Coordinates of N, CA and C in Angstrom, one line a residue:
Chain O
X1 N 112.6 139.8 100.5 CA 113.2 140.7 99.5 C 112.2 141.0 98.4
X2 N 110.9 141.0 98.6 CA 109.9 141.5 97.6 C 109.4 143.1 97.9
X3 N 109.7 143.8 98.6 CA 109.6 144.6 98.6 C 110.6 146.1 97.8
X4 N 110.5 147.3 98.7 CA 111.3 148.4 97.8 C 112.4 149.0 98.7
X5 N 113.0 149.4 98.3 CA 114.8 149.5 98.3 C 114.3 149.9 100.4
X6 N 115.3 149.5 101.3 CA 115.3 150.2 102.5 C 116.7 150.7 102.4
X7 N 116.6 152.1 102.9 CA 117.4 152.9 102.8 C 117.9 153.1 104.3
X8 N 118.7 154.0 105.0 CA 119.2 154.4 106.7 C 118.1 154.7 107.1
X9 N 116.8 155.3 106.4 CA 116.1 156.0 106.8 C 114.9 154.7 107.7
X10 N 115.3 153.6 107.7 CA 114.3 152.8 107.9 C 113.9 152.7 109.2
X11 N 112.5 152.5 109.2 CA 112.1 153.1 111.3 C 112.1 151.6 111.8
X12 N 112.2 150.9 111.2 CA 112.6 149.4 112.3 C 111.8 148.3 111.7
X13 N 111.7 147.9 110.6 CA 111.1 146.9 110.1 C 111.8 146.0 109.4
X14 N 111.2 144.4 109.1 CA 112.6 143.6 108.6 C 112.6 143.6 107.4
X15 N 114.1 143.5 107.1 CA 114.2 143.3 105.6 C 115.1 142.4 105.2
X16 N 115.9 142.3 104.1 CA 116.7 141.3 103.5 C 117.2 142.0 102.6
X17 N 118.3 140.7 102.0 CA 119.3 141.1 101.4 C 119.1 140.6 99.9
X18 N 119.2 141.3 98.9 CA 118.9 140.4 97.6 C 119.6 141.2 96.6
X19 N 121.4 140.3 96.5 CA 121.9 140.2 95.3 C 122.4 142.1 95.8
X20 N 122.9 141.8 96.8 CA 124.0 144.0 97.3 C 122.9 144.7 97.8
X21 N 121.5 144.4 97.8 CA 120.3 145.3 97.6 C 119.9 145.1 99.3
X22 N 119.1 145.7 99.9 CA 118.5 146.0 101.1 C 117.0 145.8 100.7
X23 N 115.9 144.5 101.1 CA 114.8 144.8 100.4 C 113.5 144.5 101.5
X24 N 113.0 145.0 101.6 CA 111.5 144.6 102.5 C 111.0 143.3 102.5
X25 N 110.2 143.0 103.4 CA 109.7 141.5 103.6 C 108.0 142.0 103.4
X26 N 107.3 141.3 102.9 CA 106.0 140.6 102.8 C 105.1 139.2 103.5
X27 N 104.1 140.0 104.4 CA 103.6 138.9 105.3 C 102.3 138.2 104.7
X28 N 102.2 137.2 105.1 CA 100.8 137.2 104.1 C 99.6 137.2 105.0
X29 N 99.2 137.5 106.3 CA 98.2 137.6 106.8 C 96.4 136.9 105.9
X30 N 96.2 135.9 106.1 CA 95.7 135.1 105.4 C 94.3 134.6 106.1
X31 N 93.1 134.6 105.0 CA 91.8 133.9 105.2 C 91.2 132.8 104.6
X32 N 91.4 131.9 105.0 CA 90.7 130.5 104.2 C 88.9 130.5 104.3
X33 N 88.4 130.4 103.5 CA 87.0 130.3 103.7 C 86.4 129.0 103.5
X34 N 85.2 128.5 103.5 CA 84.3 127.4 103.6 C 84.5 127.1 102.4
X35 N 84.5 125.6 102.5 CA 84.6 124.9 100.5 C 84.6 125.2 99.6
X36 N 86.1 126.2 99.7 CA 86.7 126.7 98.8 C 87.7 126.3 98.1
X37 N 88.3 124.8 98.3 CA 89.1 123.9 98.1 C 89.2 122.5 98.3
X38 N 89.3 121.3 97.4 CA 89.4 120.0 98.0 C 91.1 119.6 97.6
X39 N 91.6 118.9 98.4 CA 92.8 118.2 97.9 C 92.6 117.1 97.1
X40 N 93.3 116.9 96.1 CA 93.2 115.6 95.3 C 94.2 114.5 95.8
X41 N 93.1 113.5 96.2 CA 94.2 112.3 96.4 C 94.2 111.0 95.8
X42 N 95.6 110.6 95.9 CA 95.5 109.8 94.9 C 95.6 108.0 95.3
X43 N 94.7 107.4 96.0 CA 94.7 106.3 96.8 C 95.1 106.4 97.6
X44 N 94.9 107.3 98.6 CA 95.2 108.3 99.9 C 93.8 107.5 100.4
X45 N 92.5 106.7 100.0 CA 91.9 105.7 100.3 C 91.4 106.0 102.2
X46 N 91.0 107.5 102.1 CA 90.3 108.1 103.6 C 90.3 109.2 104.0
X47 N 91.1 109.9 105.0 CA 91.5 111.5 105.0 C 93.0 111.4 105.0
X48 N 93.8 110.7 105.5 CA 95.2 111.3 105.6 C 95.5 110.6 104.1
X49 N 96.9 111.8 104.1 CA 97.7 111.5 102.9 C 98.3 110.1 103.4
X50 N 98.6 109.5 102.0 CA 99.5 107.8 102.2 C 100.8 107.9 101.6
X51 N 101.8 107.9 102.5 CA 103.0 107.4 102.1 C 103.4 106.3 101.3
X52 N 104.8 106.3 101.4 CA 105.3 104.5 100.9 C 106.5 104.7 101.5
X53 N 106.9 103.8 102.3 CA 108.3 103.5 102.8 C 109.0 102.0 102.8
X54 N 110.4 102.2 102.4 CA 110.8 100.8 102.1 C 112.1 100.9 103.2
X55 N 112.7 100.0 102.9 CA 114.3 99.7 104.0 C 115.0 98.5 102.8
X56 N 115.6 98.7 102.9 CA 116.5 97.8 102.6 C 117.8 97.3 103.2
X57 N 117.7 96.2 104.4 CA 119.4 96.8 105.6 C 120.4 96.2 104.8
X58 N 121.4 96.0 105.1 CA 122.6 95.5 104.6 C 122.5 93.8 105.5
X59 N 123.2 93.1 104.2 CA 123.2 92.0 104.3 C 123.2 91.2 102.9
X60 N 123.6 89.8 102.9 CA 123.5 89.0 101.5 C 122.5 88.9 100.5
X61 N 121.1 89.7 101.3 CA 120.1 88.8 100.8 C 119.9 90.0 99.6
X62 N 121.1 91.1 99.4 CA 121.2 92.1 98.1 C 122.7 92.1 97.5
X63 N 123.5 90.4 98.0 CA 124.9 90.3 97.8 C 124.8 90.0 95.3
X64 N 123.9 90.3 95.0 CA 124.3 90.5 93.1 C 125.2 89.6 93.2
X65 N 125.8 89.7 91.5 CA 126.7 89.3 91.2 C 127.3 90.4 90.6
X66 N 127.7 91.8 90.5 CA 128.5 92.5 90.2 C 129.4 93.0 91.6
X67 N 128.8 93.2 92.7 CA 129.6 93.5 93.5 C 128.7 92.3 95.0
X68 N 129.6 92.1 95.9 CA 129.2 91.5 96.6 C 129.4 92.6 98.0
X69 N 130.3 93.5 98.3 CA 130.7 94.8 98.7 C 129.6 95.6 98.7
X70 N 129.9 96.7 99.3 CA 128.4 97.9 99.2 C 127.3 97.3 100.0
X71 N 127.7 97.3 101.5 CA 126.4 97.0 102.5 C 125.2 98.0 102.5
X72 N 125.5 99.3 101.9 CA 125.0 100.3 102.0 C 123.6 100.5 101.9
X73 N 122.7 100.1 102.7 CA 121.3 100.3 103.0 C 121.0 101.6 102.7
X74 N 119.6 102.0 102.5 CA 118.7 102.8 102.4 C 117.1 103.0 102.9
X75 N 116.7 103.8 103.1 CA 115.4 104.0 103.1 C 114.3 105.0 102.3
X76 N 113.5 104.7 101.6 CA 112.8 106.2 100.6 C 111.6 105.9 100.9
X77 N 111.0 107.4 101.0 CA 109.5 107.9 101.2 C 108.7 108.5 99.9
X78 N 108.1 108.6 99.8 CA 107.2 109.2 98.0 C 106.1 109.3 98.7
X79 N 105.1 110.1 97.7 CA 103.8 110.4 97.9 C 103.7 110.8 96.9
X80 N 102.3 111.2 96.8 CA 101.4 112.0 95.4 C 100.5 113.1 96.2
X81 N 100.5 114.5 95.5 CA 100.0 115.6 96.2 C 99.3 116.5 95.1
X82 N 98.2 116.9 95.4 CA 97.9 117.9 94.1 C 96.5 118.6 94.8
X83 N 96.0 119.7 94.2 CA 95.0 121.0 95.1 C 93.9 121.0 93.8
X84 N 92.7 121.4 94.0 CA 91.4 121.9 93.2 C 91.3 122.6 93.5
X85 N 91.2 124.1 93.3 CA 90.5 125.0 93.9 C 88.6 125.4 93.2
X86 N 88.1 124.8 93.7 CA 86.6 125.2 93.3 C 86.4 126.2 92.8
X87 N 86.4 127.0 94.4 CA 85.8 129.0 94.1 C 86.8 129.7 94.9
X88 N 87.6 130.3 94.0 CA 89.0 131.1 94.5 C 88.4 132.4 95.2
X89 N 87.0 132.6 94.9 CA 86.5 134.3 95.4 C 86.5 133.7 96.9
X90 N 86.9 133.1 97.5 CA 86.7 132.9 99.2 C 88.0 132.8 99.6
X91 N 89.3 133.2 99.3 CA 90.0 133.0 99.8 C 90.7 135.0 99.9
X92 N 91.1 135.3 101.2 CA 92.1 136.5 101.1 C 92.6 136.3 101.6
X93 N 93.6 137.9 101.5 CA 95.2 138.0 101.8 C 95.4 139.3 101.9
X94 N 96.1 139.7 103.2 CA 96.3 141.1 103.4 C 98.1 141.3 103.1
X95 N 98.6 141.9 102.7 CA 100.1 142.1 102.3 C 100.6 142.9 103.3
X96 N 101.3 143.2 104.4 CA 102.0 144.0 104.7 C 103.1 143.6 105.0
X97 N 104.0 144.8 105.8 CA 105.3 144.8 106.6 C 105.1 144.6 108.2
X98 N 106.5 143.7 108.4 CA 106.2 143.3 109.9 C 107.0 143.9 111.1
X99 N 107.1 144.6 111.9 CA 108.3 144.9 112.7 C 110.0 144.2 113.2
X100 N 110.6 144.7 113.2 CA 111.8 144.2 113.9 C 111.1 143.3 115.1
Chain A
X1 N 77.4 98.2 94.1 CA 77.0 98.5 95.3 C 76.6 97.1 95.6
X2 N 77.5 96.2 96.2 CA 77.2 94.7 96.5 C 75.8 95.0 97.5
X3 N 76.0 95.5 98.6 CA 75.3 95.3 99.5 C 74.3 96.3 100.0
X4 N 73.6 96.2 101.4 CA 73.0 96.8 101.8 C 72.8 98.4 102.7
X5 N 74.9 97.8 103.3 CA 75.2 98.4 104.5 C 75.1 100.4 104.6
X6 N 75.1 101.2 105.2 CA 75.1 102.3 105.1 C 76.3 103.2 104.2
X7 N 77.4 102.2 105.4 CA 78.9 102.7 104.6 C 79.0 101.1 104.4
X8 N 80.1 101.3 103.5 CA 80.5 99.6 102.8 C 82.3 100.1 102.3
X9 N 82.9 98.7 102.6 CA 84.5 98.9 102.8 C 84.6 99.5 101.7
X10 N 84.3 98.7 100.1 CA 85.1 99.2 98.9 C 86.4 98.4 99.2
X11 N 86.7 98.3 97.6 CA 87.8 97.2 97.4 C 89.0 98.3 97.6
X12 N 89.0 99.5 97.5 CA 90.2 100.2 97.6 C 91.1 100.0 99.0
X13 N 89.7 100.7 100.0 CA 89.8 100.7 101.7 C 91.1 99.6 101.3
X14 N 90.3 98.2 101.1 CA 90.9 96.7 101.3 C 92.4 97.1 101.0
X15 N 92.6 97.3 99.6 CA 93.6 97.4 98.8 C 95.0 98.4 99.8
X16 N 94.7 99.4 100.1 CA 95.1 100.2 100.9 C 95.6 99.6 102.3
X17 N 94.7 98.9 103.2 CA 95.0 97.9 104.1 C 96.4 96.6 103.7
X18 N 96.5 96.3 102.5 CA 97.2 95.0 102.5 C 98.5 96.0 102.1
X19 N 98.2 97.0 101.6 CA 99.7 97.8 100.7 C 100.3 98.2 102.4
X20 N 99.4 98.6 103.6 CA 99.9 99.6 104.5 C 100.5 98.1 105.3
X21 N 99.8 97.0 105.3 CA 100.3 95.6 106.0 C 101.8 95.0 106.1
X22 N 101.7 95.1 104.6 CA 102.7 94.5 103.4 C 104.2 94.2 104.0
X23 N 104.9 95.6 104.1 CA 106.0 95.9 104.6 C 106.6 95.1 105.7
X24 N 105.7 95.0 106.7 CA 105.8 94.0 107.6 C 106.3 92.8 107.4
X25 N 105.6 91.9 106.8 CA 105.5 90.6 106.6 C 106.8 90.5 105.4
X26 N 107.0 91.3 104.8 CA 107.9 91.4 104.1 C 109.5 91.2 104.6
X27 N 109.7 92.0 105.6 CA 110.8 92.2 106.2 C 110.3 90.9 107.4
X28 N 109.8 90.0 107.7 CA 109.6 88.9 108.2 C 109.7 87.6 107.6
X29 N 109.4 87.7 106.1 CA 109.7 86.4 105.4 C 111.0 85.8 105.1
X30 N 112.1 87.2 105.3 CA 113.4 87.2 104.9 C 114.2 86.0 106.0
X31 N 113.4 86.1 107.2 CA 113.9 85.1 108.5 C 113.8 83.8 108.1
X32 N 112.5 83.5 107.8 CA 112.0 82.4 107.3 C 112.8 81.5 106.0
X33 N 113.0 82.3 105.2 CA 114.1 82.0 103.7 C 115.0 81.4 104.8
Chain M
X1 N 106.5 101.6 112.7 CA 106.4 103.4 112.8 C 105.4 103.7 111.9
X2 N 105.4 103.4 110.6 CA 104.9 103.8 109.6 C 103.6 103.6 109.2
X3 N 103.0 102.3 110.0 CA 102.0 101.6 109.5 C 100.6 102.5 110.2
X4 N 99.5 103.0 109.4 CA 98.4 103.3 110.1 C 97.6 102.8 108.9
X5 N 96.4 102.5 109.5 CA 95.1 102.1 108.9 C 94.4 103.1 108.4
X6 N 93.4 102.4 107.4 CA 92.4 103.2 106.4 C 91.5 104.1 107.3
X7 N 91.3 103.5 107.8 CA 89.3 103.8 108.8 C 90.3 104.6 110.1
X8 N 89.7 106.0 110.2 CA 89.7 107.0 111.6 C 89.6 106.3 112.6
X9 N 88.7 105.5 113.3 CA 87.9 105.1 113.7 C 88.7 103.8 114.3
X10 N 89.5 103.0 113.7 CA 89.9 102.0 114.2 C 91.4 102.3 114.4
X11 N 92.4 103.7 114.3 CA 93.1 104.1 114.2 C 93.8 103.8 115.7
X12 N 95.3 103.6 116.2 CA 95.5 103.0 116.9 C 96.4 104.5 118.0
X13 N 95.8 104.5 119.2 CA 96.5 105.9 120.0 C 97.1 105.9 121.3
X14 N 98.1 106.3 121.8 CA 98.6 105.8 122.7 C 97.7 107.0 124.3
X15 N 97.5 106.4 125.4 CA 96.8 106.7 126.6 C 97.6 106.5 127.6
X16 N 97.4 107.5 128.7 CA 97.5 107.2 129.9 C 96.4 107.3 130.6
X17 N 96.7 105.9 132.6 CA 96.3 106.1 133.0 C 96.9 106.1 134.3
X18 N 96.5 107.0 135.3 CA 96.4 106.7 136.6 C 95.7 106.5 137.8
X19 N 96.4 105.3 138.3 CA 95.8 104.4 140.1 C 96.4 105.2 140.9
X20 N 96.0 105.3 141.9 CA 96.3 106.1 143.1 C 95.5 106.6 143.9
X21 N 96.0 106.9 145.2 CA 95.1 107.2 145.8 C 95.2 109.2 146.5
X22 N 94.2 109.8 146.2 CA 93.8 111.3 146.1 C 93.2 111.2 147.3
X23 N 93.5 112.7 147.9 CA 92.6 113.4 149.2 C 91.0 113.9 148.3
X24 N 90.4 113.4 147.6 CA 89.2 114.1 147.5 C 88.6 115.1 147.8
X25 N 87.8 115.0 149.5 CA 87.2 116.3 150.0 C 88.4 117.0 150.6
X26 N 89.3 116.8 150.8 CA 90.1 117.9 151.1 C 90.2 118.2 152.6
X27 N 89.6 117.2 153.6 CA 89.4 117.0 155.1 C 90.6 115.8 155.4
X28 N 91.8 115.3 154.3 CA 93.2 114.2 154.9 C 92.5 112.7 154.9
X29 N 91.1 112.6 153.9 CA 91.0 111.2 153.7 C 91.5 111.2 152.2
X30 N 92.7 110.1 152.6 CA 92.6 109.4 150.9 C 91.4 108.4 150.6
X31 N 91.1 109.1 149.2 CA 90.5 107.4 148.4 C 90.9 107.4 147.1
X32 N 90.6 106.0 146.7 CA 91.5 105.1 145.8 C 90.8 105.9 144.2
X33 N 91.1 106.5 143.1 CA 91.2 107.2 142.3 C 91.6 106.5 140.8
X34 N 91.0 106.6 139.7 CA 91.5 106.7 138.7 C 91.3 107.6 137.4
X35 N 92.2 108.1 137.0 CA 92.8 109.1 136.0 C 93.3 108.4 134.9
X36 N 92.2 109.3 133.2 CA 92.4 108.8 132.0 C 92.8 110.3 131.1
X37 N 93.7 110.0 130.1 CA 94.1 111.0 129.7 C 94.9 110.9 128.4
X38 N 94.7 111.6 127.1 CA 95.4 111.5 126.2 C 95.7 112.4 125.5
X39 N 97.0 112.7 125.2 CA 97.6 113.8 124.4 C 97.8 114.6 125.5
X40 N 96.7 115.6 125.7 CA 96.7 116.6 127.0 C 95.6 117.0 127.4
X41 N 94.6 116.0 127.1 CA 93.0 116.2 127.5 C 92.7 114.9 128.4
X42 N 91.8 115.5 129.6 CA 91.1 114.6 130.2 C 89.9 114.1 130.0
X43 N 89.9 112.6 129.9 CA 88.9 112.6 129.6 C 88.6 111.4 130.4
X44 N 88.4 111.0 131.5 CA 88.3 110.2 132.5 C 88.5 110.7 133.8
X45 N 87.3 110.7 135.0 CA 87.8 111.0 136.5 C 86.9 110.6 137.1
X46 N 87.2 109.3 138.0 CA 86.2 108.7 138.7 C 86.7 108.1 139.9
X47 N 85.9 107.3 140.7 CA 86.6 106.5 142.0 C 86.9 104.7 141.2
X48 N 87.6 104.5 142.1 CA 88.4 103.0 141.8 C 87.1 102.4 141.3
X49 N 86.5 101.2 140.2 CA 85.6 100.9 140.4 C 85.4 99.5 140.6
X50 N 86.4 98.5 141.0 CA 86.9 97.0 141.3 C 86.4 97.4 142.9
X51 N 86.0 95.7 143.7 CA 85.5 95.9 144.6 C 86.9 96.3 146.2

């Protein structure tokens, strides 16, 4: 829906709906070039990014003293993520419309 | 640069190794208790 | 699940392999065969090599 109004008149391309409106779609047809970017990592300590995952199951060994109830386990994931772009003159992008 | 070697671990590498270990032995000492 | 190590290199990957026995030349002799293979690349093809 970044595009301009599509009317009946449209010969077959996709569009969307934004807010009663009829609106064109935008592709990004895209070129990455040679070290034009590093990722910043943050004890990521190699090439892949590093998670953290924990568990917690149900059982006593989270029985408190406010509630002894509530077996209700969990599990959470986190990371740290962030981009440098060096030299932005190496990267393009062609914009068009895509067909039905 | 302790040493000689070409590549050398770095205390991070290490650090990274015992965090990625961890979880394990964690959820195993609970048996033990 | 979760656990992988620092170093590429000592990173841990799961393989197949196959024993069996293959017509080779294609004249109805089997011989004894093994086949190495991971993900979807070959990268192993040789005769049995145990005596």
């Amino acid at each position: 829906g970044a595009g301009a109004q599509a009317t009946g008149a449209n010969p077959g391309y996709r569009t969307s709906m934004v807010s009663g409106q009829e609106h064109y779609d935008v592709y990004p047809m895209l070129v990455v070039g040679d070290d034009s970017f590093t990722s910043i990592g943050f004890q990521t300590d190699g090439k892949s990014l590093k998670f953290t995952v924990m568990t917690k199951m149900p059982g006593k060994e989270t029985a408190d003293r406010n509630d002894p109830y509530g077996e209700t386990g969990f599990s959470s994931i986190k990371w740290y993520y962030g981009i440098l772009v060096k030299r932005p003159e190496r990267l393009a992008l062609i914009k068009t419309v895509a067909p039905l | 640069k302790l040493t000689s070697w070409k590549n050398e671990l770095s205390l991070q590498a290490l650090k990274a190794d015992l965090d990625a270990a961890k979880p394990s032995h964690t959820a195993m000492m609970i048996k033990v208790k | 699940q979760e656990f992988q190590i620092s170093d590429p290199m000592r990173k841990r990957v799961v393989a197949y392999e196959y024993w069996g026995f293959w017509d080779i030349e294609g004249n109805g002799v089997l011989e004894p065969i093994v086949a190495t293979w991971i993900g979807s690349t070959l990268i192993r093809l040789e005769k049995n090599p145990y005596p």
